[PDB]
Design a protein around this motif. Structure first.
Motif, PDB file in Angstrom:
ATOM      1  N   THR A  36       0.743  -1.268  -0.022  1.00  0.00           N
ATOM      2  CA  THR A  36       0.056   0.204  -0.092  1.00  0.00           C
ATOM      3  C   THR A  36       0.927   1.184  -0.065  1.00  0.00           C
ATOM      4  OG1 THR A  36      -0.470   0.128   2.422  1.00  0.00           O
ATOM      5  CG2 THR A  36      -1.942  -1.095   1.272  1.00  0.00           C
ATOM      6  N   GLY A  37       2.321   1.034  -0.037  1.00  0.00           N
ATOM      7  CA  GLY A  37       3.046   2.333  -0.186  1.00  0.00           C
ATOM      8  C   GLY A  37       3.704   2.447  -1.504  1.00  0.00           C
ATOM      9  N   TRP A 195      -1.619   6.363   1.345  1.00  0.00           N
ATOM     10  CA  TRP A 195      -2.612   6.600   2.286  1.00  0.00           C
ATOM     11  C   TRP A 195      -2.027   7.131   3.496  1.00  0.00           C
ATOM     12  CZ3 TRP A 195      -7.487   4.893   1.090  1.00  0.00           C
ATOM     13  CH2 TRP A 195      -7.599   4.094  -0.275  1.00  0.00           C
ATOM     14  N   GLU A 196      -1.878   8.643   3.482  1.00  0.00           N
ATOM     15  CA  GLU A 196      -1.695   9.309   4.411  1.00  0.00           C
ATOM     16  C   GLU A 196      -2.506  10.005   5.466  1.00  0.00           C
ATOM     17  OE1 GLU A 196       1.799  13.286   4.869  1.00  0.00           O
ATOM     18  OE2 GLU A 196       1.092  12.506   2.842  1.00  0.00           O
ATOM     19  N   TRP A 197      -2.378   9.714   6.635  1.00  0.00           N
ATOM     20  CA  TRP A 197      -3.380  10.325   7.745  1.00  0.00           C
ATOM     21  C   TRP A 197      -2.533  10.828   8.941  1.00  0.00           C
ATOM     22  CZ3 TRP A 197      -4.136   6.983  12.338  1.00  0.00           C
ATOM     23  CH2 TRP A 197      -3.078   6.087  12.538  1.00  0.00           C
ATOM     24  N   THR A 198      -3.028  11.050   9.981  1.00  0.00           N
ATOM     25  CA  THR A 198      -2.957  11.766  11.101  1.00  0.00           C
ATOM     26  C   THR A 198      -3.264  10.977  12.483  1.00  0.00           C
ATOM     27  OG1 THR A 198      -2.582  13.936  10.137  1.00  0.00           O
ATOM     28  CG2 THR A 198      -2.531  13.813  12.364  1.00  0.00           C
ATOM     29  N   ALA A 218      -0.017   4.497   6.035  1.00  0.00           N
ATOM     30  CA  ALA A 218      -0.173   3.043   6.126  1.00  0.00           C
ATOM     31  C   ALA A 218       0.374   2.379   5.027  1.00  0.00           C
ATOM     32  CB  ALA A 218      -1.944   3.061   6.096  1.00  0.00           C
ATOM     33  N   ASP A 219       1.429   1.627   5.497  1.00  0.00           N
ATOM     34  CA  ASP A 219       2.188   0.795   4.421  1.00  0.00           C
ATOM     35  C   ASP A 219       2.446  -0.474   4.737  1.00  0.00           C
ATOM     36  OD1 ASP A 219       5.642   1.784   3.085  1.00  0.00           O
ATOM     37  OD2 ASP A 219       4.003   0.143   2.679  1.00  0.00           O
ATOM     38  N   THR A 220       1.624  -1.554   3.960  1.00  0.00           N
ATOM     39  CA  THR A 220       1.860  -2.806   4.115  1.00  0.00           C
ATOM     40  C   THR A 220       3.014  -3.565   3.717  1.00  0.00           C
ATOM     41  OG1 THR A 220       0.694  -3.127   1.946  1.00  0.00           O
ATOM     42  CG2 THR A 220      -0.827  -3.179   4.057  1.00  0.00           C
ATOM     43  N   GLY A 221       3.896  -2.608   2.623  1.00  0.00           N
ATOM     44  CA  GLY A 221       5.169  -3.152   2.236  1.00  0.00           C
ATOM     45  C   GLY A 221       6.358  -2.720   2.758  1.00  0.00           C
ATOM     46  N   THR A 222       6.236  -2.097   4.092  1.00  0.00           N
ATOM     47  CA  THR A 222       7.303  -1.724   5.232  1.00  0.00           C
ATOM     48  C   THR A 222       6.803  -2.861   6.351  1.00  0.00           C
ATOM     49  OG1 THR A 222       7.598   0.463   4.340  1.00  0.00           O
ATOM     50  CG2 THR A 222       8.130  -0.161   6.646  1.00  0.00           C
ATOM     51  N   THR A 223       8.241  -3.608   6.666  1.00  0.00           N
ATOM     52  CA  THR A 223       8.165  -4.176   7.880  1.00  0.00           C
ATOM     53  C   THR A 223       7.619  -3.674   9.239  1.00  0.00           C
ATOM     54  OG1 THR A 223       9.811  -5.867   6.725  1.00  0.00           O
ATOM     55  CG2 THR A 223       9.172  -6.304   9.092  1.00  0.00           C
ATOM     56  N   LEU A 224       8.588  -2.645   9.650  1.00  0.00           N
ATOM     57  CA  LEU A 224       8.462  -2.040  10.869  1.00  0.00           C
ATOM     58  C   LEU A 224       7.737  -0.788  11.082  1.00  0.00           C
ATOM     59  CD1 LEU A 224      12.217  -2.606  11.806  1.00  0.00           C
ATOM     60  CD2 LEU A 224      10.547  -4.292  11.956  1.00  0.00           C
ATOM     61  N   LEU A 225       7.596  -0.204  12.273  1.00  0.00           N
ATOM     62  CA  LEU A 225       6.855   1.008  12.814  1.00  0.00           C
ATOM     63  C   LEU A 225       8.006   1.949  12.760  1.00  0.00           C
ATOM     64  CD1 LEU A 225       4.426   2.616  13.369  1.00  0.00           C
ATOM     65  CD2 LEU A 225       4.462   1.492  15.655  1.00  0.00           C
ATOM     66  N   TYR A 226       7.896   2.934  11.822  1.00  0.00           N
ATOM     67  CA  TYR A 226       8.704   4.086  11.835  1.00  0.00           C
ATOM     68  C   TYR A 226       8.220   5.298  12.226  1.00  0.00           C
ATOM     69  CZ  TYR A 226      11.831   0.985   9.478  1.00  0.00           C
ATOM     70  OH  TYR A 226      12.703  -0.247   8.838  1.00  0.00           O
ATOM     71  N   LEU A 227       8.612   6.011  13.581  1.00  0.00           N
ATOM     72  CA  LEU A 227       7.889   6.885  14.100  1.00  0.00           C
ATOM     73  C   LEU A 227       8.985   8.022  14.353  1.00  0.00           C
ATOM     74  CD1 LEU A 227       5.354   5.264  16.225  1.00  0.00           C
ATOM     75  CD2 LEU A 227       4.819   6.358  14.162  1.00  0.00           C
ATOM     76  N   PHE A 305       3.364   3.541   9.344  1.00  0.00           N
ATOM     77  CA  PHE A 305       2.826   2.751  10.020  1.00  0.00           C
ATOM     78  C   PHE A 305       2.795   1.320   8.901  1.00  0.00           C
ATOM     79  CE2 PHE A 305       1.309   6.606  11.676  1.00  0.00           C
ATOM     80  CZ  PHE A 305       1.055   6.217  12.860  1.00  0.00           C
ATOM     81  N   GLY A 306       3.950   0.777   9.250  1.00  0.00           N
ATOM     82  CA  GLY A 306       4.175  -0.505   8.677  1.00  0.00           C
ATOM     83  C   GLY A 306       3.421  -1.551   9.382  1.00  0.00           C
ATOM     84  N   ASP A 307       3.911  -3.145   8.762  1.00  0.00           N
ATOM     85  CA  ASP A 307       3.281  -4.293   9.200  1.00  0.00           C
ATOM     86  C   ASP A 307       3.250  -4.491  10.699  1.00  0.00           C
ATOM     87  OD1 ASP A 307       3.008  -4.688   6.732  1.00  0.00           O
ATOM     88  OD2 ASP A 307       4.972  -5.990   6.803  1.00  0.00           O
ATOM     89  N   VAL A 308       4.143  -3.830  11.559  1.00  0.00           N
ATOM     90  CA  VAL A 308       4.122  -4.135  12.959  1.00  0.00           C
ATOM     91  C   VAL A 308       2.938  -3.332  13.416  1.00  0.00           C
ATOM     92  CG1 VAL A 308       5.334  -2.890  15.095  1.00  0.00           C
ATOM     93  CG2 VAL A 308       6.713  -4.569  13.436  1.00  0.00           C
ATOM     94  N   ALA A 309       2.339  -2.279  13.102  1.00  0.00           N
ATOM     95  CA  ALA A 309       1.462  -1.319  13.371  1.00  0.00           C
ATOM     96  C   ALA A 309      -0.087  -1.916  12.804  1.00  0.00           C
ATOM     97  CB  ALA A 309       1.371   0.030  13.113  1.00  0.00           C
TER      98      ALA A 309
END
Length: 330
Positions: A36-37, A195-198, A218-227, A305-309
């Motif tokens: 989704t990214g 799919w950019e949100w707040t 919201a990115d299903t193609g990224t493994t981790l949560l990056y904040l 917000f990758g797969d972890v989230a």
């Protein structure tokens, strides 16, 4: 119409998820990473440089009665992790979980980078971000979802990723049995093609939720949560022995630790990521140091917000005229 397909982790860490996709006539089934990214559907193929193929299933357009070469068209993509691929372009019939799109652009790789070659389980990507990010030249092509939309019962798809388990991508309907409580919907900006949100804030473990705006994708193609670094530092400060390691490339922690949960806000609602979801195992085989699943986005330029989230939620990607995102606990 609708479709429903099971998505399966590629390994014991949920590094990525693969979903079977039928391409061509007769069908050639490839296992694609739904992303989704990004916004390109590209595949390993009979045209991929032979030395760059190692175990993947390939698409052979010459064996498909419905494949059509898009004359002169090319594509070339570079992802956030530094990987890349490029090639030429066909259209063909593509089906996901019973949902069929005719004339879908299927981008055939002539070249792929080493990370793709080295991953035998992923036969290509199926992009589900906005079609404005599609890399086909001279004329940009539409995503599978964009092409399917008008035919779907409802202009939506949902991601229900599993923790160390299979999950589901649905197209055209909301499975009301797949989540607990209610779905909270939140605004989307398409200005960057994502799919950019707040998010409305966060909590660490049993701590009181901090209300603060966090823009991300919201990115299903990224493994981790990056904040943001502030948020990530507050999380890892609650883990004994955790530290940021420049040599390893992020926060690490003793494998014996009990990790706290991490909560993110969706409007007035809350999604709780269990601590176990944040454990990505030993940094190298046999090490007692483990890699964290929440990492700083500083220097990425965007929060992810990758797969972890996402795997902690049932997620609705609402492609109505004004798109929105929905999140429910499950």
């Amino acid at each position: 119409s609708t479709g429903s397909a099971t998505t399966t982790p590629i390994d014991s860490l949920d590094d990525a998820y693969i979903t079977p996709v039928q391409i061509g006539t007769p069908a050639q089934t490839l296992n694609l990473d739904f992303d989704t990214g990004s916004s390109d559907l590209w595949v390993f193929s009979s045209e991929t440089t032979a030395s760059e193929v190692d175990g993947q299933t390939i698409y052979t357009p010459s064996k498909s009665t419905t494949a059509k070469l898009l004359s002169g068209a090319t594509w070339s993509i570079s992802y956030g992790d530094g990987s890349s691929s490029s090639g030429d372009v066909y259209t063909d019939t593509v089906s996901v979980g019973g949902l069929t799109v005719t004339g879908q652009a299927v981008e055939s790789a002539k070249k792929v980078s080493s990370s793709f070659t080295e991953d035998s389980t992923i036969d290509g990507l199926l992009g589900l971000a906005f079609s404005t990010l599609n890399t086909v030249s001279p004329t940009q092509q539409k995503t599978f979802f964009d092409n399917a939309k008008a035919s779907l019962d409802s202009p939506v798809f949902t991601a229900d990723l599993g923790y160390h388990a299979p999950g589901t991508y649905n197209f055209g309907f909301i499975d009301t049995t797949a989540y607990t409580g209610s779905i909270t919907y939140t605004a989307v900006s398409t200005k960057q093609g994502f799919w950019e949100w707040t998010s409305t804030g966060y909590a660490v473990g049993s701590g009181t939720f901090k209300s603060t705006s966090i823009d991300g994708i919201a990115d299903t193609g990224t493994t981790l949560l990056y904040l943001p670094a502030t948020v990530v530092s507050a999380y890892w400060a609650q883990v004994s022995g955790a530290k940021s390691s420049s040599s390893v490339g992020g926060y690490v922690f003793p494998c014996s630790a009990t990790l706290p949960s991490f909560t993110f806000g969706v409007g007035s609602a809350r999604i709780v990521i269990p601590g176990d979801y944040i454990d990505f195992g030993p940094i190298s085989t046999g090490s007692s140091s483990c890699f964290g699943g929440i990492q700083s986005s500083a220097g990425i330029g965007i929060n992810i917000f990758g797969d972890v989230a996402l795997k902690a939620a049932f997620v609705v990607f609402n492609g109505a005229t004004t798109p929105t995102l929905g999140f429910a606990s499950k």
